[PDB]
Design a protein around this ligand. Structure first.
Ligand SMILES: CCCCCCCC/C=C\CCCCCCCC(=O)OC[C@H](COP(=O)(O)OCC[N+](C)(C)C)OC(=O)CCCCCCC/C=C\CCCCCCCC
Ligand SMILES: CCCCCCCCCCCCO[C@@H]1O[C@H](CO)[C@@H](O[C@H]2O[C@H](CO)[C@@H](O)[C@H](O)[C@H]2O)[C@H](O)[C@H]1O
Ligand SMILES: CCCCCCCCCCCCO[C@@H]1O[C@H](CO)[C@@H](O[C@H]2O[C@H](CO)[C@@H](O)[C@H](O)[C@H]2O)[C@H](O)[C@H]1O
Ligand SMILES: CCCCCCCCS[C@@H]1O[C@H](CO)[C@@H](O)[C@H](O)[C@H]1O
Ligand SMILES: CCCCCCCCS[C@@H]1O[C@H](CO)[C@@H](O)[C@H](O)[C@H]1O
Ligand SMILES: N[C@@H](Cc1ccc(F)cc1)C(=O)O
Ligand code: NA
Ligand code: NA
Length: 442
């Protein structure tokens, strides 16, 4: 007896609650900042349109048709065929992403706690930068908040699809959006807008002569859409034929892009206002945003509201991360949902511990050459497993399915849009992924 979404809106809100999270505010800010701004942004937007939306609809189609996990969907639909390595890669991508995703989500909790206990109301004597560096370098303090966030994620995944994942507050996501628009409006009035908006929207094409910017653009695209690791195959496996998938794919990609763009209009005028470099790195928003909340009279409550709504977005994103291997181990080992969520959840928490330490005592340690542990596991997950698993997912429908079945299961016809969707799964998206892989790694 497999689970289904109880409500009709349950599927689209789950997929939206999974795509909109830390990647839109935290990750989109520091990757766009260190990749130059507008030229990376255009490549990113182009990848969202011509690669992201089709592969999202591909994941939806695969999951609903098979009614099975990330891996089981390929076993079921193509028995004995090697397409299930994408689900396998997707499962491993969940262990890795959620490991460090919970570290960054723990930072949200720590800042939330400091705004409840009235600590970060005024600037600390070491500044907002030094406050952040001292917290993340601390060996044990980030672990406490990381484990705290993981317990919240395990709890919801253990409760189930009907009573846990789907019972997410329908108001927190539109409230996060209203606050980002209000805050993007405020930072436009701080003095660095002309330089922040030019950085964000006036392209410097000299950046685009670097293979790494395309690789960072395709990774941020796959990351922010919860794409390439079967998470949308999993959420699609709980929906019935009473659903139109193409509108869901466009809506998730459209809304998810709206957050990142607005998050950019909020962050970068503030960065140039504070005279800060756009390449600050992973802790950019954690240094820039507390400064912004300090310049506001009612700023403490803004930070309280911001880190509540942001953590809620991270909470629902982590739930879809954990649900991917959990659905695997429920079928594969006949584990119960509570046993798999707790076991895998505790394990993934341990996996992220070296990522948390790599901001401090393990900062000198590297795995892949020139990247620390956090950046090494983020790289192989976001830059290797997510884009390759997406490429295989696209070739699966484009070349392993009959055209009529691909169109019928995705609620498309042989119209211009159906032909267009089949064209990008068959050629545009996988070849673009291929060219980005080839040009980046020599
Ligand atoms: C080093 C990483 C080794 C591979 C990691 C994935 C893995 O080994 O984790 C266990 C999987 C799950 O096994 P399964 O769901 O595919 O069922 C068994 C069906 N059988 C027999 C065709 C595989 O085992 C496998 O896939 C075996 C690995 C085959 C595909 C990974 C290629 C590397
Ligand atoms: C967000 C909602 C989550 C609900 C869970 C509620 C958890 C409540 C338990 C709080 C435990 C905090 O634990 C305690 O936090 C304070 C900060 O306030 C730390 O404070 C310490 O760390 C910082 C480093 O950033 C030092 O600069 C500071 O001088 C020092 O006092 C303590 O070393 C730690 O022992
Ligand atoms: C409440 C619903 C939320 C949804 C949308 C809300 C939008 C929020 C807009 C807040 C933007 C405030 O932006 C802030 O406004 C005042 C002017 O009003 C500016 O203040 C500036 O102009 C005013 C008057 O011209 C002077 O008092 C001040 O000396 C000067 O610094 C701030 O430099 C600017 O940072
Ligand atoms: C609200 C979204 C609109 C943001 C658009 C900003 C992108 C173009 S900025 C533009 O860059 C030029 C040189 O780069 C300067 O000559 C101009 O003074 C300046 O206007
Ligand atoms: C709680 C709602 C806050 C929404 C976020 C927008 C922040 C803008 S607040 C703004 O800060 C100024 C100081 O520059 C005050 O002088 C103004 O009176 C006040 O309007
Ligand atoms: N898409 C989420 C992160 C994510 C969730 C689920 C995934 F399967 C992958 C990635 C974000 O942008 O924060
Ligand atoms: Na996102
Ligand atoms: Na989310």
């Amino acid at each position: 007896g497999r689970e289904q979404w109880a409500s009709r809106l349950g599927f689209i809100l789950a997929a939206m609650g999974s795509a909109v999270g830390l990647g839109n505010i935290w990750r989109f800010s520091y990757v766009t900042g260190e990749n130059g701004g507008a030229a990376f942004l255009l490549v990113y937007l182009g990848f969202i349109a011509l690669i992201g939306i089709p592969i999202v609809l591909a994941e939806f189609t695969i999951g609903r048709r098979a009614q099975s996990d990330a891996v089981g969907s390929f076993e079921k639909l193509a028995p004995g065929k090697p397409w299930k390595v994408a689900g396998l890669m997707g499962v491993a991508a969940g262990f890795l992403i959620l490991s460090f995703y919970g570290v960054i989500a723990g930072w949200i909790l720590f800042y939330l706690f400091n705004y409840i206990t009235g600590q970060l109301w005024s600037a600390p004597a070491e500044g907002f930068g030094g406050f952040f560096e001292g917290f993340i370098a601390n060996p044990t303090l980030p672990l406490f908040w990381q484990a705290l966030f993981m317990i919240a994620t395990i709890w919801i995944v253990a409760i189930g699809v009907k009573k846990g994942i789907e019972r997410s507050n329908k108001i927190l996501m539109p409230l996060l959006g209203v606050l980002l628009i209000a805050l993007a409006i405020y930072s436009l009035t701080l003095g660095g807008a002309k330089e922040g908006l030019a950085f964000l929207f006036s392209p410097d094409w000299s950046a685009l002569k670097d293979p790494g910017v395309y690789l960072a653009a395709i990774s941020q695209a796959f990351f922010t859409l919860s794409l390439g690791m079967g998470a949308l195959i999993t959420y699609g496996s709980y929906v019935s034929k009473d659903s139109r998938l193409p509108g869901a794919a466009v809506s998730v990609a459209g809304l998810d892009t709206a957050f990142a763009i607005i998050a950019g209009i909020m962050i970068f005028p503030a960065v140039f206002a504070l005279g800060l470099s756009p390449s600050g790195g992973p802790g950019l928003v954690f240094v820039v945003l507390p400064d912004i909340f300090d310049s506001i009279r009612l700023g403490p409550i803004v930070g309280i509201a911001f880190f509540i709504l942001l953590g809620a977005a991270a909470l629902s994103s982590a739930v879809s991360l954990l649900e991917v291997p959990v659905a695997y181990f429920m079928r594969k080992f006949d584990w119960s949902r509570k046993q798999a969520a707790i076991t895998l959840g505790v394990i993934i928490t341990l996996l992220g511990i070296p990522s948390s330490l790599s901001f401090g005592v393990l900062g000198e340690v590297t795995i892949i050459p020139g990247l620390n542990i956090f950046d090494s596991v983020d790289f192989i997950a976001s830059s290797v497993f997510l884009p390759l698993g997406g490429m295989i997912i696209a070739l699966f429908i484009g070349w392993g399915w009959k055209t009529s079945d691909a169109l019928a299961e995705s609620d498309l016809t042989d119209s211009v849009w159906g032909k267009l969707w089949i064209l990008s799964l068959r050629f545009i998206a996988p070849i673009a992924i291929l060219i980005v892989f080839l040009s980046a790694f020599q």
